[PDB]
Amino acid sequence: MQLTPFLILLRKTLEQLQEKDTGNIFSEPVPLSEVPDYLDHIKKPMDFFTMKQNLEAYRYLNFDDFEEDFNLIVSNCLKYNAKDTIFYRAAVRLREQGGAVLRQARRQAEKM
Numbered sequence: 001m002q003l004t005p006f007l008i009l010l011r012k013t014l015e016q017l018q019e020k021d022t023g024n025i026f027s028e029p030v031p032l033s034e035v036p037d038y039l040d041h042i043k044k045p046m047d048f049f050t051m052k053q054n055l056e057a058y059r060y061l062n063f064d065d066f067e068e069d070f071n072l073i074v075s076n077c078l079k080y081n082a083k084d085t086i087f088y089r090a091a092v093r094l095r096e097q098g099g100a101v102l103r104q105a106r107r108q109a110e111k112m
């Protein structure tokens with residue numbers, strides 16, 4: 001397991017996950033200016049831009065740490081937003097579509 005091919009794969013996987021976020025509602029931190037009470041019960045906010053920064057800082061050296069932050073994007077959104085909102089359903093769909101992306105990516109990593 002070499003570092004450079006692995007990060008190439010995480011970069012490709014991150015792009016495939018962002019592609020599932022057609023609304024771009026997960027690509028940047030939740031704007032605290034518009035959601036001022038957001039950090040009341042969300043102890044670790046997460047988004048795809050932050051994941052890209054963490055990736056390039058070598059903070060993802062295994063698949064599970066990368067997948068954990070993706071799951072955080074999903075779980076934070078399910079936690080904060082009511083079930084009858086667009087945001088909540090978008091997180092459900094991201095969980096479903098992103099899960100398929102991640103399983104295939106992990107198979108490619110397990111070949112390495």
Ligand SMILES: CCOC(=O)c1ccc2c(c1)NC(=O)[C@@H](C)N2
Nearest residue numbers: 025030031034035077080081087
């Ligand atoms: C510009 C104002 O838009 C929002 O209020 C807003 C913008 C982005 C958001 C969000 C709210 N809440 C979330 O849970 C996730 C989906 N991101």
